[PDB]
């Protein structure tokens, strides 16, 4: 229902489909493997309009800020540079990312107090589930 219940530290607890979800995006296999084994933290926090997503693991550790609506230049993990935008709809968070002629979704909601993060591009699509570290 808003954006401030996606805040907190969340760690890796399920995961469905990221290794075909990065076949997909053309991710080369030195990656894909670290992202299979790597069970990350995420940690949302927000004030107001304005949004941080930081995953953290010894495998894997990158971050990005926004501002709800406005685009801006995404460094994915995987080394893309993506035009993204977030935005809170419908209580969920939906991240749209756009790069040479490509689109990818994903979409963050909590679900059982449990953070449920969806991605797809092409129909391929990703589930993981992560619960909150306190
Ligand atoms: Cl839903
Ligand atoms: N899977």
């Not at 469905?16 to 670290?34: P, S």
């Not at 953290?56 to 801006?72: I, M, R, V």
């Amino acid at each position: 229902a808003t954006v401030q219940q996606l805040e907190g530290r969340w760690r890796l607890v399920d995961s469905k489909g990221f290794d075909e979800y990065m076949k997909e995006l053309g991710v080369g296999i030195a990656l894909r493997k670290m992202g299979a084994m790597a069970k990350p933290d995420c940690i949302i926090t927000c004030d107001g309009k304005n949004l941080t997503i930081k995953t953290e693991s010894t495998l894997k550790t990158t971050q990005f800020s926004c501002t709800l609506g406005e685009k801006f230049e995404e460094t994915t993990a995987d080394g893309r540079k993506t035009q993204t935008v977030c935005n809170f709809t419908d209580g969920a968070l939906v991240q749209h990312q756009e790069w040479d002629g490509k689109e990818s979704t994903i979409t963050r909601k909590l679900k059982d107090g449990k953070l449920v993060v969806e991605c797809v591009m092409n129909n391929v699509t990703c589930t993981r589930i992560y619960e909150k570290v306190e």
